[PDB]
Structures are given as C-alpha cells and as structure tokens.
Amino acid sequence: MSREEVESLIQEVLEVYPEKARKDRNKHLAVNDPAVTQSKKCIISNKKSQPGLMTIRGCAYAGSKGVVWGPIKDMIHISHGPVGCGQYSRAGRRNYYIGTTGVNAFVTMNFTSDFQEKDIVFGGDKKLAKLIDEVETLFPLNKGISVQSECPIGLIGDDIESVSKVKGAELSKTIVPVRCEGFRGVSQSLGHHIANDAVRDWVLGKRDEDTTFASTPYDVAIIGDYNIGGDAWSSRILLEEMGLRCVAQWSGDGSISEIELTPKVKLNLVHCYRSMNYISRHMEEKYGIPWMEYNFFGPTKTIESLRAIAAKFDESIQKKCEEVIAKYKPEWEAVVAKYRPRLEGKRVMLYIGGLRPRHVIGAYEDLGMEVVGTGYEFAHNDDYDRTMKEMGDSTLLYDDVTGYEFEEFVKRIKPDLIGSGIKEKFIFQKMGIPFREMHSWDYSGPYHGFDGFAIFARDMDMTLNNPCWKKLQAPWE
Amino acid sequence: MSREEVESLIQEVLEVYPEKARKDRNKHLAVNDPAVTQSKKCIISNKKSQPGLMTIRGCAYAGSKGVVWGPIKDMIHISHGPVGCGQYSRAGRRNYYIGTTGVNAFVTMNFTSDFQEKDIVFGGDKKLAKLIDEVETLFPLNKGISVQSECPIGLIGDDIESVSKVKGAELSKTIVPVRCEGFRGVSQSLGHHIANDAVRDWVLGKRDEDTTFASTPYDVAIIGDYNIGGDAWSSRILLEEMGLRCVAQWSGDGSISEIELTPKVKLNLVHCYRSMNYISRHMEEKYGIPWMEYNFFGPTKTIESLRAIAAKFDESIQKKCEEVIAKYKPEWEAVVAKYRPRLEGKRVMLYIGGLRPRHVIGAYEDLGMEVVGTGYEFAHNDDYDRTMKEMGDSTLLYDDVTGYEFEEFVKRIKPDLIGSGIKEKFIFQKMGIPFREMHSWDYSGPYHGFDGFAIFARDMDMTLNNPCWKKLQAPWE
Amino acid sequence: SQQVDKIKASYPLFLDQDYKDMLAKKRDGFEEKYPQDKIDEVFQWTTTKEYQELNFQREALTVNPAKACQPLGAVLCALGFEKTMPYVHGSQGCVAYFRSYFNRHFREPVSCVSDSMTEDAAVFGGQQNMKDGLQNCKATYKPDMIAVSTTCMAEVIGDDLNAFINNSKKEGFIPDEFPVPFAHTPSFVGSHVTGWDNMFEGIARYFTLKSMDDKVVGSNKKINIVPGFETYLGNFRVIKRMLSEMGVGYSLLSDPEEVLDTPADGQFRMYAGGTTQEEMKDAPNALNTVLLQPWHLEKTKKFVEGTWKHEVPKLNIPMGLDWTDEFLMKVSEISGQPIPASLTKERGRLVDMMTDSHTWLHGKRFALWGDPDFVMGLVKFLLELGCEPVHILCHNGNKRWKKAVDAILAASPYGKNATVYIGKDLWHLRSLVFTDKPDFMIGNSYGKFIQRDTLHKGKEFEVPLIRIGFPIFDRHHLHRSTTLGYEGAMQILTTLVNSILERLDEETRGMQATDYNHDLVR
Amino acid sequence: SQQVDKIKASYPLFLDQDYKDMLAKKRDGFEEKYPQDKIDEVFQWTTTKEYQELNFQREALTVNPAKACQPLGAVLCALGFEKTMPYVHGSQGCVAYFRSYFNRHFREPVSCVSDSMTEDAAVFGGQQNMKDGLQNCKATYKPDMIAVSTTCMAEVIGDDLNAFINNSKKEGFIPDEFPVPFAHTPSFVGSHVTGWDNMFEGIARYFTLKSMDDKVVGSNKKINIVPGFETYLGNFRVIKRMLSEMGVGYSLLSDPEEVLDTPADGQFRMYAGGTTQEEMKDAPNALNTVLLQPWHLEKTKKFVEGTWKHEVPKLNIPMGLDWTDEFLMKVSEISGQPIPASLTKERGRLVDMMTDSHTWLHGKRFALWGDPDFVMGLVKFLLELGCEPVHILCHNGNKRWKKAVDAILAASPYGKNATVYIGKDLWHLRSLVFTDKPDFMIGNSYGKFIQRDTLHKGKEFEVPLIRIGFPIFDRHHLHRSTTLGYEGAMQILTTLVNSILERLDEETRGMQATDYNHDLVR
C-alpha cells in the first residue's frame, strides 16, 4: 500500500471522532520510515488513554502483580483490596514454574484481603497484619510476602509500608509493600516501574554484605523473561550449552533467592527492555554490572544474540557458541524447509504490549512472512526508536490503538494473519481472518529459542492454512 | 388378594386369546396351594411356546453357549453359523472370571464363523477346519475349543463331529462339537442338557485313567454357579472357611482342567439344579459321586446349607461350620437391623429362568418381604415341585408367561417391587413400579452368600424406597 | 466380610486380602494356568507388526465383529410405523436377543414377537406357526399392522412368506384387509442395515405397488425422507426440525422416535407415534424421495425410482458442514423453499466453533468404525476439522463404498495417512492401534476392550475411546444425542475437543512433574 | 531439541533429559529450595483435620475465592439490552479484566468501555471523564444506549453518577433524551451478582419511574422474566422455548443470547438482539414479573413490587423436577394458559431418565459451589436423584439463604450428612474434600486445582471435578449447555451418571486385576 494511501486511511478512520479525541489519536498513528532514528518525530506514546474509546490496555496492578511479581514462585503475593482484581488475574498468564503448589510455590493461587465496606471506611491495615499471621500459619514454607495494592489502598490513606516494616521485623521475613494501585500511571507500564523500585528497595540489597556465594566469570542473569509456556527454559538451555551459568531468571520460574543473588553476576541479559530496564540501570549504577539487550525469537535473531553475548566473554565461550549454532542448524533448517513454503509472502498485523510487537518480526521473516502493521499498548518512545528499523518502509504503526481503529485498519489492509490478545481474537475470527494469540501463545509454546521456533512455525501454519477459513460464506449466500 | 380373586384374575386375562392359545395358557397359570406335593396337579411346564404371544424365552444356543460353555475361561467358544447370535450374546451375561483377555482367557470375546451364502449352500465344515487353524495360530494359549452350533448347522447337514475328531487328533487338542441349534427344544433348557452331554462325551472322561491328582476327604465341586457378579467367589470363600477344598466351579470362573478334575471329588454341591442335574446324575452313576442341592441366598438358607453340607463330612468340618456361622452372624444381623425395617411387609413379584424364582424367596423373607407371585421361563415340573412349599398359599404361579399376562397380573396385584429381566425392566418402571434385574443383578452383586446378602439388601432398598417413584404423576395431571 | 455402613459390591470387594488369597489358591491348585511370564510374552507378541500380518491373513475366523444380522434392522424399521408389531417368522431365540440388544441401547421397552418355530417346523415348514401366530398376535397385542421378517432357520428351509401370509388370510386367521407387509431377511447376507432396507422396501411395495395408476409425482408438494437404520433420537428430531424451519412439507417414512422415548407417567405404551399407513399409501405423490443413508438403501432406491418414478438425488448423509450444506441446497431446489435465516445463522455458529477449537483438533489422529454412511460422514467431518482419520473400518462395507471414501480422502491433505478397511473386525483394528497408534478411537462400546488392551502395554500406549455409534451400553442416555446436521456437528466437535482436553489434563495433573502445563485456560 | 515431524510443545518437551537436568541444576544451584521430605511433610499436614481447624479460623485472609466483583455483573446485565454499550466509570484496568474474563468463558467478543480515570481524577473527581467518555463512546461505537456502572476508585472518591450524567447532557456532550441509565456498583459490597441486580434496577427505574401514571397491570397480557446473572446460553433459550410452547406472552428483560453467539460469517457484529427500550418502557403493563434467580434480585424485587405494583411470586430457580413443575404451574396461573402436552411429556421423559439411572446415582456424595440460586437448585436436584450434597459452599451466600438451604436439606433423608458454608472459599473446600472425602466435586474450572491436590495424596483420594458453573475456561463450548428446566435437568443427570461410569471404567480397566468388573453393559 503506498505511503499516501496509508496516510489517507489514517485520516479516514479519524473522521469518526469528536475533535478533542481526533486531535489526540492523530498523534498515535503513523506510517513507518526506517531512516528515522528519533521516533518522536513520527509518533507519541505513553500518554493517557482517551475516555470511552475501548483501549486494550490494563492498569498498574496488572503490570506489577500480574507481570513482575506474580511469577516469583516461592513468595505469596497478596491482592490487597476488594475481590475482583485477584480473581480476574488468577492463572490468566502462563508464567510457568516448577513447584508444589500450595506447599512451597504459590503462583496460580489467589490470595486476597477481600475488602468489605468496613475496611474501606476504617482502613485495612489491621486486617493486613492479621492476614500476614494467617499466611504464616497456613503456608509455613513461603519465603516472603508481597502486598500488591489495588485502587482503594492509597485512596483511603492506608499505610502498608508501616505494616510491612513492623510485621517483617516481628517475623524475620521479607514483606514487600507495592503501591501499584490501578489509578496510577496510564497503563501496565508504570506498574513495571513501581514493581522494579519495590524489588530494589526491599529485596535486591539483602545480600550486599554477604561474601559466601561462589562466583565464576561466566555468571549471568536472564532479566525480563516471564517464561510464557516455558520460554525462559528454552532460552536458558542455550546459554548454558554455550558455557554460561544462569544464576537468575527474572521473573519466570523465579525464586526470591535468585533475585537476591543477581547482584553477584557478571552480565545482565535483558530480553524485555520495557519491563526491566529500570532495575538493570540500577544494577549498573550501584554494582557496576553491565547489561545488554538480546532477542531469542527465531534463528536469525537467536544466532545473532548468542554471538553478541559470547563476545562479552573469552574465546572459550565463543567456541562453545559456534558449537551450539552448529548443533541446532539442521533443526531449524528443517523447520524452515517444511513451513516457509507454506507461509511465504503472507502478511501479518500485530498488536501486543511493550516488547513483542518488534521482537517477533525476525521470526516471521525467517518464515518468509511480512509484518505490515505493528503497535503497542503501552510502549514508550524508546521502544518505537527500536521498532522503526525493524519494520519496512510505509508500514503502519499504532500506539494504544482503539478497538474501532484496529478493526477499520484490518478491513482495509486485509492481512492474512493477526497476532494480538484475547480481547481481539474472537472479533477477527468472525471476519474470517486467521488469528494467533501473541501473549498466551494460544496455549502453546514455548516460542523462544531454537526449540520454540519449531513450535512457532507449526502454530502459524496450523492456523493460517486451516481448512476452516474457506467455510465462512454459505454456498447459497 | 384371596384365592378366588386370583382365580378370577387368571380367567379374566385369558379372555383375550383365541381358543387354542386360551386352552393352552390356562394350563400354565395357577394359584399356589402349599399342601400339594405333585406340581403337575396344578401347573404344566416345559412345553412349546404359543406363536405370536411374546414369550420371554430364548433358545438352545443361549442355554449352551450363553449359559454353560461360554463362562469356561481358558477355552475358545466358536459361535458357528451367521453373525447375529454371537454378537447379541457377547458380554451380556456377567459370568465373572480372572484372566488376561485375548491371551489366556476369552470369555468376553466373540469368535464366529460368520456364515455367508456360500457356506449355507455348500456347507461350513471346510470353513470350520480352516477357522480352527487360524485360532491355533493367533491364540496359542487356548486350552481347547468348543463349536456352538447356530440354527443353520443341522439344517444344511454339516458334520461338525467329524471335523472336531479329525482336527482334535491332528492338533492334540480338545475340540468339542455342540449341537445346540436354536430350533431344538422349546427354550434355553434343552441347551443345558445338550451342553451337559457334550461335557460328558468330550471332556469329562479325559483323566479317567490318571491317578496323579492327590485327593483329600474334603474335596467338593460347585456345580451350577455361573459366578454372576462374583456369586461363586462369595460362595467358595465360605466353603473353604468351613475346611472344604473346592476343586472345581461349574462354570463361572471355570477352567477346563477343573472340569477334568471333577470326577476326583467326594461330593458335588449343586446350586442350579435345572442346568446341571444331568451331569450330576451321570457322575453319581459312573463315578459313585453323591450330589446334593443347596441354597446360598440369604442368611437363613446359607446357614441351613452350610450345616447340611458339613454333616456329610466329619466332626472337624462340623466344628469349622459353626465357626463360620459365628463369624458372619454379627455381619448379617447388622444388615437385617438396617434394612428389614425399611422393607418389612413389601410385596414382590418375580419372573426369572429356571432356579432363582424359588431360590431367592428365603432372602426376601429374611428382609420381611413377601413374594406374592413367581414364575419361570423354562423350568420343568421338578422345579415347580420344589416351589409350591416355598411360596405362600393363594400366591400366583406362571409358567412361560406372556408379555400381556405379566402386565395384566401386575396391574391387578400392584406389587411394591418386581424382579425380572432386561426385556421387562423398562415396561414396569414406566408404570411406576420399582424394578430390580434378577438375572444381571442390575450390574451389582454378588448376591450369594453372607457378603452377597448385604449387597442384595442395599439394592432392594435403594430401588424400592427411591425418591423417583413419587414423581411420576404431574402435579397438574 | 462386609461393614454395614460401607457395603462393597464386586469391585472393590474381591480386592480384600481374603478373596485375593482364595483366588490365588484356586488358580495354583486347579486351573493349570500358563505361567505369568508366558502370558506376558504372548500379550507382547499380540501387539506386534508380525502378529498384525498373521491377523490380516485370516480367511475363515472372525473375532469381535462390528456388525449384526439382518432381522435386527427389519425390527427397527418396523418399529417406525404407527401401531405396528414387528414379527419375526422363525426361531424365538432371535427375538429375545433383538429385544435385549435394543433394550440395552435405548433403555426402553422393545416390542417384537416370534412364531416359535421349533424342530417340527424345521422339516415341514412354518405355515401353521404363521397362521396361529398372526391370529394370536393380532388378538393379544392389537396392532394395526404386523410387519413380517425372517430368522435364518426360515430362510434355510425356504418358507414362502407371501404364500404363508396369503393362506393365513384365505383360512380366516386374520382379516383379508389387515396389513401384513413382509421381507425375507437372511442373516447370512449383508448385515443389520440390509435388513432395514429389505423391510422398508417390503412395506413400501405393500402399500403402493398395486395402486400406482392414480399417482402423480409432485401432487402432494412434499418430500419423502427415508432415514435408514438410525439409533440416535436426535437424528430423527433434527431432520424434522430443519425441514419445518424451512417450511418444507415432508413425510418421514419409518419414524420410531416416539416409541423409543415414551414418558414414565404411570402407564406403559406399547405403541406411540410412527409413520401412518396413509403416509405410505400417499408417498408416490411426493415431489421426490431423499435417502439419508444411501449406502444401505439401495433396494429401496430401485423401488422408489422404478415404481414411484422419483428422481432420487445423489446426496451423502447430512453429516458435517459441506454435506449438511448440500442437503439443504438440494431440499431447497426440490421444494422451492429458500434456506431461511435461522439455518444460515446456525451454520455460522458451527463455523465459529470450528474457528474456536481448531488449534486443539489440528493433526489429531483417529481410528473409527461403524456402518458405511455414518463412517464416511465422520471421516468427512474429521477432514473439515483438520484431523487425520488414520484407520477407517467398516466391517459391513463394500468395494464401491470403499472407492467413494478413498476419493473423499484424496480431496484433502488431511487424508494422506488414512486407510479404509472393509471386511475387517475389531480384532484387526486392535492390531492397527498398536502398530500405528492414533490419539483416540471413535466407536461403540466394544471399543472399551481395545482401550483396556492398549493400557495394559502401558499408559503411554493407551488409546482412549470416544463413544459415538451403536450400540452404546456402558453410558446412559447417549442415544438422545445428535450426529446429523449442524446440531450434530456441534455436538461431535464439542465431544472431540473436550476428549482431547480431558486427556491433556490427565497427563498434566502430576504435581511438580507435569503440572507446569496444567493450565486454567485452554 | 526438536524432530521436525513430531514437534513437542511445553508438554512433553520439558520432560526430555536435557531439560530435566537443566531444571535440577537450577533448583540446586540457586533456588534455595526446601528439601523434598519437608515439602512432603507439609503437604501431608495440609490434608489433615488439624490443618482444617486452623484453616476454618481465618478472619482476614481469603485464598482462592469463589466470587467476583459487582461491575462484572453490571456489564453482563447491560449486554442484554439492544444496541447497548456497557460503560464502567472509573479505572480502565477493570474493563480489561471484565472483558477477558467473559471472552475466555464464552469464546466471543465482549464489548465494554471505560472512561479511564487516572490519578488526576482521584482527587478532583471524574466529571470530565464522563463528559468526554460519553461523547466519544457515542460517536465511535454508535450505541443506542449507554449503561453506566462504577469501579471501586469511583465509589471510594464518591463520584455522583446522576449529577455527572446530568451535567454531560446539560453541557451538550450527549443528547438530552439519549438513554444513560446508571448504577453504583461497589466491589467491596456483595459480589458480581449484586452488580447485576443493581444495574438491572437502574435500567428499570430509568425507563419507568417517571411514566407510571398511564400504566395498568395486566394490560399487555405478558409476563416479564428477569433472568439474573446467567452464563449458559441454553438457560435463556430454554425459558423462551417453554413459554412459547405454552402460548404465554413474555418479555425477557436482559437477553444477551444473540450477542454472546454471533455467527462467524465474515463480519463482526458488535451488537445483536437484546431487550428493546420499548419492552422496558412497557414492562409495568405486564401481568406480573417472575425473577428466575431471586436470591440475587432483591433490589429489583423491591422496585418491581413498590413501583410497578406487581405481586412477584415466591418461586425458587426453575432447576430440577419439583421447582420446574412449580414454575410452570405459577406461569399457568398468572397467564391462564394450561401446561401443554409437549411439556407434560418432556417432564415424563426426565422422570424416565431418573428411573433408568437411579441405581448408579444412589448415595453418591458431592462437594459443590457457585452462586446462591444455582447452588440451591443443584442441591435440590441432587436430593431428587437420591444423592448426598455433603459439602455445599457459597462464598457469596448470606445467612438468610443458608437457613433456606438448611430447610431444604431437612425435608429429605438425603440431606442428613450435608453442611452449608457461607463466606468460605476454595481453600476451605479443599480441606473438606480431604477430611470428609466425597465421590465428586461439581464446580467451575478453579476446582481442577483441588482435583490435582487430591490426586497427589493418592489415586484412592482423588476427587474428580464435574464442570458446572462459571467460569469454565479449560473446556470448550460448555457455555452452550442448559441447567434450567427439564432440559437442564436431563443434561445434568446425564453428565453426573456418565461421570460416575467413566470413573468406574477407569478403576476397572486393569487387566487381570480389576477388569473382572469392566462390564460391557451398565
């Protein structure tokens, strides 16, 4: 589609809105130019959503509890406030772990303070202190507690920090207060930042004065992989076959001790830049640990990433890197041979959260597919800066897209496949457009690493080429 | 009801029939008089069914294959003829066994010669010979074969006896030809007799010149217990707790070697008189083995039987008998205390095959129930002789009852419970009359012995007192 | 022993130590049983490709058939006519079995009589049995029609039904005008479905052959529907429902849905509903006749085309999406009624469900069996779902049918790994699910024993059964289901996807082992 | 590693040796994990009566609730009106969750908007959000009505919905006559079902309060039906079908069946079907109003009785045999229409199925949970079936409801070992199924974790889940089922008896061990 045609589609879609919304939405829709390095010249992001337009975004509690803290397996995370938030978020995100649930691991459980009127009127700090003692009695193997604030906590003037400090000392336990009330910020994004600051302030420095950990020159941490469908395990295996020692995973399958050990590593490997850049910057500043961004979606990016990581270490790691690449070469080449001819030339539109809308492009290209439109719920301009070179010229970019916009863009562009979330899936299937969930992996995965690529290709093919998509039109009309 | 009312009921029912059927049916319907000892003075039996009247009876193949031979677990029984008979009879009868089905035991399988037109026109004996070789190849652990003739075999002039002799000698295997064509006789009964003669002629004498079995004074066989829901196992346990050695079970859970060992025992214990009196008489004449009837339905009969049996042995068995009685006494008394108050005075009508219509009466009386009507599909007058003393004065007796008669009797007598078979169950449930299957035990049991009595009592209660029976009339009409 | 407050039936009573010791003593003392290691060796052999090759060489032995005999199907056909008694001329044992077989599937009464031919009739014929039997049946059970079929004894001895019935009327045993249609139904030809065809054609000829002169095709503006052998109540009901929603006048010829589903209200109803004698007499005046199950309605087709001069359309059974669409389009053409909005919407709801569940269905491998029309409709729907029907067995199938199914498989890439078997039984199928293991079987209750056998090899070898077909004896009320139309396809889809998800939950239920993938949401 | 012809997803990929070794090295190197013998000790302790006593002393901690918050129910209610957009005034995170929760249960689009109050509104209120939000939603999504509820932020800060909507009209953001009914829906009061009642009463008041002078009870010859929070499509459908079969005029008030089941035909329909504004305006002219789920329709009842002057009958949910009968008799009385032959026959078909399956059901013990009306109907039907509902849990139940269920349990001997729990959660229920083990649980998908836990103690302690309720996320298309009426009771009965037979088959599948009881016929 020409740049002029894409620009005209944007203006046409914007015609529906009242003036104030029109002027704002115009700023969040753009036609890509890969030459641009400063993305603010073309698009704005990380602004409030316009009321009434059916944003896809969530809140800061989703960003903190659902994303960052919830996956940590050996802690108990309290959804503090009324009953809804913890229930809707219970076991929705496939942040996989190994443990004995209800005994030493607690990830798919919903712990809550279930606020009632009296707790709203008179405060919930007394109930919080009693809840903590109930948790200690009934879940003795927990290794710490987080308190994930829902909307009312800060609105009623509760002091969860005082409760965490007093109870934590009393019980000799790490109790972490998190002020992730959903009214804060504009999206999930501020919940990441809040959550990162809470890790910094309450957990990360615990072993600052301890010298007992035995280090090696090859110690790393995986920062920002939430182990969706096992993604982090299919990443870890490669790093360790390359000769590295993965001390920590933040936070998929993560434990509190791994977090505390992370300041002992030599290099922080950041997959999700959006959600974990904050703590990675902190660790560079305080501990002198360098950090680097990587990408394990598809063979081209995984190979590039392995080589870049290995180059930070000695010749021995570089040699093992080449051995890993040679081992997996026939595997991923067989995947390409089988699936690329079935997918070559097909066009995809993506809409995801803060990373994947750029990160998965190389894997689609490894199967001959073209990403014709992409966007993010809650990314910042530094994310867009990283996206412009990854997308082709004259492709469509959309920040915090509205339900109306996404539907109208799809009707014009007519992609072969859409990759987005659960709130979008069932809309586009009705329209006869193959759809893949690119948050949950549609209950499949992993998609990271060489083993994940196989799964990714199989899944894109099964859906795009399924016999169901030829059957939507009745033969009589 | 009174005697006069039952007699008028019979005459009223018979008014529907044409004269020839009316004259015949009158002979098969009677009001019991327990002062009569020769049942032929009151009822006739074991006659042909009148055409078109919806008898409940089966055929001689059901009596031979389904009843006698089928249960023998380590032989392969061929349903020889077209495909129907073996299919309808596959795994319908719950003659339980221990084995590895398809490997060393074969009870629930359907082996057939699946006759087609060429086999009817030119004969099946060549097919049968080839079938036997295929059996030997694919089921090498079978311990012998029987050939259960369906209707066409004798009609087309096949010679299965010649095939069985020639192939049995060639393979050094017991191959038993059974001429149980369904056209023979008038019911299942003649199939029992045919089957008994076939055991006599082809299996029972195999060890006549072998003295290696180490016999004891306490050796018995259970004759005529087909182990329905495990009934023979719940009988055997008592006999062996009494100090007897049960060398064989005919034929539930039975093996070919136990049959062959039966002429070595001291006493044959006959449960089902109807089906196995023939071979019991044979073994008395040829080997000098005495036989006796017994009854293991309900505690009163079971206790009487154990004492009668133990009296044939020595003081040591008599002492063990009293030990068994003392062990089970609190168990059956606890069943009666629970269930008899829930059942006392309730009235039951029965319709079953050749034994149970009289055999279960004691068990019903142990729960305070009254058997107000009974009858048999295929009993002979020797069975009715044994019935008239067991049933109360002025109760109704019916031989080879028609569908019409049974329905009209139940409409007038209005029993609280009916005990009959699968072809009857669903009719009476619609009428709002609790129904228990008294062939298959409604997929429950065992009913024999002390352990069986607890299940019997639970079952009669569950059904008779079920909440469903007060719900058949809509509250608006 | 028993504890009164927790009474044990066979399972688990016989697992008590004293019973286990007793059974060990029985075995060791008297059974002369093969050693366990030999049993294990033989079992393992029966799972191999070598055994499969020997099994597939059988010419004379059948083991665990997947078919029944003609008169069963004649009885089911006869039950679909108003106040009609099925009557099977021949030996009574057959009737006991037919009635019981249906009783267990439908959990309903099944009325049928015999004329109780015994050894006397075996040589001299069953004429007297016919005369008295017809008279007796009419007087006692008061049918409005008696529909006569045969057992194999009667067929082998050559009893002439037509002559015997005619002599019964000549001698006054039943009125001349009382309808007694008949068919010869030999169990040694075809299967139960052939008996249905033969009975139906006998009933159609009885009511129409001699009255054709006044008939005009299309004069009643209806379409006749002939269902064939059908044991799901929902299948009769969905066809009626769809035709009524379209405003199509129709006559369902053989309709047993009422008599196979009477209420429990305090009375027994021997007869209920059914096709009327007037409907059969009038049937040549329809626009046309549609056969739902054409692969077992071949004799009926020849009669309808040759005598009634209906141009019977070439339609597959209406199973799955494409064949249901084709059915409705042809009914629209014949009737002149457009396909209504209701049905268009229902089709789109099926397609929605296909889009929703495709990821879990994709590539799943099935073994399946049953009667020809049913099996080919299942195959076609499985291909529409992106599933692989790897082992397709039809014991009662023929070579022309097999070619038709091979052509359906060749039209989809999902058919590439599939084979169609005819003349083979469930002991042949057992070998196939060991040597080329599928994910599931779709079949009748006899499949339970194959599942059992596969589990014995090991949990990782187990092939679960999904019960669809006839007979189903080990679950309750499945006979109320639907397999035809969009409604039936929705029921089948739901059953298949949830069987997959149930199995996956079983395999992921292990704490700290496989429960990383025990997802709340699927 | 992967083999291209047989790719493995997470299960069973991570069971490969290399993964297993990697995960052991992670654990041992860095997780500082409790030793396995201590994990096993604590697990065992959590199954005991001692732990149960501590668990039931909780006052501050909730674990694994069985309820959600008010605005979820307000959104469901709003979806049942024609061309109506649900709008939740407050924070947008909430709407993401409400939409996703329903998307996963129904496998359908769920449309709802927020006005995206952030920290700025937290302290000056959300008036501007309302103004711009209403205007934006109307323009963009073109609803004919916007039904407003609240998130907890908006409740805590005290935003006056009435005033804010009135000011939006005054200042021109939305037309004066454009319908904007509203309800305050605090998540810290009651549960999702209370949000449904609050929303419905707000919509009812909006269309009727100021226009009562011309209304005359009975003048439209209809009965209003208010369904409450209902997540089975077949429940809306069965009620409409039964009333239609009776010839009763009716208005279903809140009808989301169309919008929760649009076809996949190439177009997305944001709105479909629903109760019309004309039907709500005319509702006071009905004969009467029947509440299907009265234990969460108490605010609605006060309005309907106090303002519309309808004498709402005292009816339980129409679940099971007796309560369906009572519903039909009361509808007959109010309408003057007799109960027709069709429904009388359907009732007798249910009774027949009860007679057929009673032997397997008798005495079976159940744990169960859900919303108050659903739970009491399930308890009532279990007692009718001769089952024992031993553990009855309603997290969102109240004292008055508990007294009513305890009274039902007293009217039957099958109630004797039953206890009703209110305010208790699924961690409470987990203890009960360990210490007083039932045969099965009847509940929503969150029960799978309890089945997991029970299996971990041992196969003999496993309590299988039967999925009936909301949400169901781990099976597909169960939302299409029915629980109300005779049809619902038939479906429930079938599911219960076949669950029992499935489990018995599993327990008897062991070759030469338990397969003596692996019967073909049951």
Ligand code: CLF
């Ligand atoms: S009395 Fe068999 S069911 Fe019949 S029509 Fe022949 S195949 Fe079919 Fe007895 S032996 Fe058997 S069951 Fe009858 S035929 Fe005779």
Ligand code: CLF
């Ligand atoms: S933004 Fe919670 S779902 Fe809401 S009405 Fe309150 S209980 Fe119910 Fe984010 S933290 Fe949560 S999810 Fe919303 S409330 Fe705020």
Ligand SMILES: [Ca+2]
């Ligand atoms: Ca029934």
Ligand SMILES: [Ca+2]
């Ligand atoms: Ca859908």
